[PDB]
Enzyme design. Structure first.
Site, mmCIF file in Angstrom:
data_model
loop_
_atom_site.group_PDB
_atom_site.id
_atom_site.type_symbol
_atom_site.label_atom_id
_atom_site.label_comp_id
_atom_site.label_asym_id
_atom_site.label_seq_id
_atom_site.Cartn_x
_atom_site.Cartn_y
_atom_site.Cartn_z
ATOM 1 N N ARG A 125 0.836 -1.198 0.000
ATOM 2 C CA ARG A 125 0.000 0.000 0.000
ATOM 3 C C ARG A 125 0.858 1.230 0.000
ATOM 4 N NH1 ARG A 125 1.769 3.163 4.535
ATOM 5 N NH2 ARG A 125 1.051 2.167 6.474
ATOM 6 N N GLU A 224 -6.994 6.943 7.955
ATOM 7 C CA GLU A 224 -5.867 7.650 8.603
ATOM 8 C C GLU A 224 -5.316 8.766 7.696
ATOM 9 O OE1 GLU A 224 -1.283 6.761 10.052
ATOM 10 O OE2 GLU A 224 -2.779 5.244 10.453
ATOM 11 N N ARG A 228 -5.618 5.773 0.914
ATOM 12 C CA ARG A 228 -4.647 4.681 0.925
ATOM 13 C C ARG A 228 -4.912 3.835 -0.326
ATOM 14 N NH1 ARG A 228 -2.709 3.221 5.960
ATOM 15 N NH2 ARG A 228 -1.911 5.087 7.041
ATOM 16 N N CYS A 270 0.770 10.524 9.900
ATOM 17 C CA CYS A 270 1.780 10.003 10.830
ATOM 18 C C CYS A 270 3.200 10.074 10.236
ATOM 19 C CB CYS A 270 1.439 8.554 11.241
ATOM 20 S SG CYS A 270 2.708 7.769 12.367
ATOM 21 N N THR A 272 5.591 8.162 10.578
ATOM 22 C CA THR A 272 6.085 6.840 10.132
ATOM 23 C C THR A 272 5.707 6.556 8.660
ATOM 24 O OG1 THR A 272 4.116 5.536 10.719
ATOM 25 C CG2 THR A 272 5.838 5.806 12.476
ATOM 26 N N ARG A 279 4.132 0.470 2.412
ATOM 27 C CA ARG A 279 4.214 -0.635 3.372
ATOM 28 C C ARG A 279 3.919 -1.890 2.559
ATOM 29 N NH1 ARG A 279 2.383 -3.995 7.552
ATOM 30 N NH2 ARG A 279 0.065 -3.797 7.446
ATOM 31 N N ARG A 308 3.575 -7.406 12.893
ATOM 32 C CA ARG A 308 2.278 -6.960 13.332
ATOM 33 C C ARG A 308 1.389 -8.189 13.483
ATOM 34 N NH1 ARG A 308 0.604 -1.189 10.260
ATOM 35 N NH2 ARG A 308 2.681 -0.204 10.620
ATOM 36 N N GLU A 313 -1.785 -3.706 12.912
ATOM 37 C CA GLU A 313 -0.959 -3.283 14.031
ATOM 38 C C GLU A 313 -1.816 -3.302 15.335
ATOM 39 O OE1 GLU A 313 0.108 0.832 13.594
ATOM 40 O OE2 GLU A 313 -1.938 1.444 13.097
HETATM 41 N N1 LIG Z 1 -0.102 -9.264 3.507
HETATM 42 C C1 LIG Z 1 -1.413 -9.063 3.909
HETATM 43 N N2 LIG Z 1 -2.440 -9.852 3.481
HETATM 44 C C2 LIG Z 1 -3.731 -9.679 3.850
HETATM 45 N N3 LIG Z 1 -4.109 -8.677 4.680
HETATM 46 C C3 LIG Z 1 -3.195 -7.807 5.139
HETATM 47 C C4 LIG Z 1 -1.779 -7.943 4.783
HETATM 48 N N4 LIG Z 1 -1.116 -6.935 5.425
HETATM 49 C C5 LIG Z 1 -2.044 -6.225 6.127
HETATM 50 N N5 LIG Z 1 -3.282 -6.757 5.944
HETATM 51 C C6 LIG Z 1 -4.539 -6.235 6.519
HETATM 52 O O1 LIG Z 1 -4.557 -4.827 6.310
HETATM 53 C C7 LIG Z 1 -5.446 -4.258 7.259
HETATM 54 C C8 LIG Z 1 -4.817 -2.984 7.825
HETATM 55 O O2 LIG Z 1 -3.720 -3.344 8.676
HETATM 56 P P1 LIG Z 1 -2.815 -2.165 9.305
HETATM 57 O O3 LIG Z 1 -1.759 -2.782 10.118
HETATM 58 O O4 LIG Z 1 -3.666 -1.012 9.716
HETATM 59 O O5 LIG Z 1 -2.044 -1.691 7.953
HETATM 60 P P2 LIG Z 1 -2.034 -0.345 6.998
HETATM 61 O O6 LIG Z 1 -2.994 0.717 7.427
HETATM 62 O O7 LIG Z 1 -0.624 0.011 7.050
HETATM 63 O O8 LIG Z 1 -2.461 -0.768 5.626
HETATM 64 C C9 LIG Z 1 -5.717 -5.303 8.321
HETATM 65 O O9 LIG Z 1 -6.976 -5.891 7.959
HETATM 66 C C10 LIG Z 1 -4.636 -6.342 8.019
HETATM 67 O O10 LIG Z 1 -4.960 -7.673 8.449
HETATM 68 N N1 LIG Z 2 -0.972 3.708 11.679
HETATM 69 C C1 LIG Z 2 0.233 4.163 12.081
HETATM 70 N N2 LIG Z 2 0.673 5.353 11.687
HETATM 71 N N3 LIG Z 2 0.937 3.456 12.951
HETATM 72 C C2 LIG Z 2 2.218 3.902 13.537
HETATM 73 C C3 LIG Z 2 1.841 4.779 14.774
HETATM 74 C C4 LIG Z 2 0.627 4.181 15.555
HETATM 75 C C5 LIG Z 2 0.377 4.732 16.974
HETATM 76 N N4 LIG Z 2 0.139 6.167 16.959
HETATM 77 C C6 LIG Z 2 1.571 4.446 17.895
HETATM 78 O O1 LIG Z 2 2.285 5.368 18.324
HETATM 79 O O2 LIG Z 2 1.822 3.293 18.259
HETATM 80 MG MG LIG Z 3 -3.797 1.060 9.286
#
Ligand SMILES: Nc1ncnc2c1ncn2[C@@H]1O[C@H](COP(=O)(O)OP(=O)(O)O)[C@@H](O)[C@H]1O
Ligand SMILES: NC(=[NH2+])NCCC[C@H](N)C(=O)O
Ligand SMILES: [Mg+2]
Length: 356
Positions: A125, A224, A228, A270, A272, A279, A308, A313
């Protein structure tokens, strides 16, 4: 800055001091010196230090603990953001600039687990912020709606594999919503870290998800970040997953204006997620290496990878399935970030096969 805010900042700072079990980057880098020198500062849209750090004060289990309410915040509170950004992304100094966007030679990427014994699914993503809009804590209800209309109208012009439908959360049935979340497609509702950053106001207005029929291409609207952009499928064919993302992003970037900074790259809510905003993750089982979650994490960190839980996360592993991804996003190219995940996962699989 009004006195009530000052009071709250002071008790907030006092609370971080007395929290010996707190391990956030905020606790680490907000020293008295730093604190005194920015606590009276306010941005053009009236964001204060309290708006920056409240999430991390309220949630002591935060790893990072700050967000930027508006773009200006990254500079106005630079003495706090700069060392946290340096720390998180593994070396990014005052003199450093994020390099220009570079997807790289997609043909060099490989399939991750051809036998299919370890990897369940692969996901990449990115995030983007629309020019002319602040981040979540400074948006009005009207602005959420405006951005939703802009984004969904743009995505309705996507073609071929990327062709799809926008589904607003407003009016989505509870059943459909929960199913999309459980299947890992849709963001979850009610994240406490986001909520305490005032980032969920007016929920669900303006929030929703676009996806094609296969659900291999998805766009999240106003969670967020403003956008995305997500590519994912079962298995470990990283080259196909990445290719699809590159195509979608370059297509969308030609239609919408995204905030990009000379130093920080693409701007996100954020710190990060700055820079490439990328990611790249796998859902993976490693029966022998993941026996101790702590040992898994120590190995992963030597490869600049983050671990994670299964549902994202701040969640636990269910059934031995972990989300493993590149940690760093700023100070390296898109190609470098995805290679860090690729190379690290290849080696961790080799170690799992060799382990007794
Ligand atoms: N490789 C993957 N395959 C399937 N689902 C994933 C994978 N990586 C993350 N997810 C899903 O993405 C969703 C968001 O996870 P999160 O940790 O908030 O990641 P982000 O916001 O960085 O995309 C959650 O439902 C998680 O299980
Ligand atoms: N979705 C994110 N930006 N995650 C990284 C930071 C998440 C949360 N604010 C922490 O300090 O643990
Ligand atoms: Mg997320």
């Amino acid at each position: 800055v009004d006195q009530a805010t000052l009071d709250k900042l002071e008790a907030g700072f006092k609370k971080l001091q007395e929290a010996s079990d707190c391990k956030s980057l905020l606790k680490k880098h907000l020293t008295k010196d730093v604190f005194d020198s920015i606590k009276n500062k306010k941005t053009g849209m009236g964001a204060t230090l309290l708006d920056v750090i409240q999430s991390g004060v309220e949630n002591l289990d935060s790893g990072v603990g700050i967000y930027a309410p508006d773009a200006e915040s990254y500079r106005t509170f630079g003495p706090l953001f700069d060392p946290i950004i340096d720390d998180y992304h593994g070396g990014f100094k005052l003199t450093d600039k994020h390099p220009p966007k570079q997807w790289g030679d997609i043909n060099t990427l490989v399939g991750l687990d051809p036998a299919g014994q370890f990897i369940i699914s692969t996901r990449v993503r990115c995030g983007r912020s629309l020019q002319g809009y602040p981040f979540n804590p400074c948006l009005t209800a009207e602005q959420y709606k405006e951005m939703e209309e802009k984004v969904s109208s743009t995505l309705s012009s996507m073609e071929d594999e990327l062709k799809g439908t926008y589904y607003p959360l407003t009016g989505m049935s509870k059943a459909t919503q929960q199913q999309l979340i459980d299947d890992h497609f849709l963001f979850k509702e009610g994240d406490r870290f986001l909520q305490t950053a005032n980032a969920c106001r007016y929920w669900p207005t303006g929030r929703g998800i676009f996806h094609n029929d296969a659900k291999t291409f998805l766009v999240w609207v106003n969670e967020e970040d403003h956008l995305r952009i997500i590519s994912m499928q079962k298995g470990g064919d990283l080259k196909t997953v990445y290719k699809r993302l590159v195509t979608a992003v370059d297509n969308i970037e030609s239609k919408l204006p995204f905030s990009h900074d000379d130093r920080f790259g693409f701007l996100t809510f954020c710190p990060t997620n700055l820079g490439t905003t990328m990611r790249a993750s796998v859902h993976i089982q490693l029966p022998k290496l993941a026996k101790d979650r702590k040992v898994l994490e120590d190995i992963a960190s030597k490869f600049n990878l983050q671990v994670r839980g299964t549902r994202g996360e701040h969640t636990e592993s269910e059934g031995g399935v972990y989300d493993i991804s590149n940690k760093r996003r700023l100070g390296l190219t898109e190609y470098q970030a995805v290679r860090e995940m690729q190379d690290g996962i290849l080696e961790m699989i080799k170690m799992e096969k060799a382990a007794a």
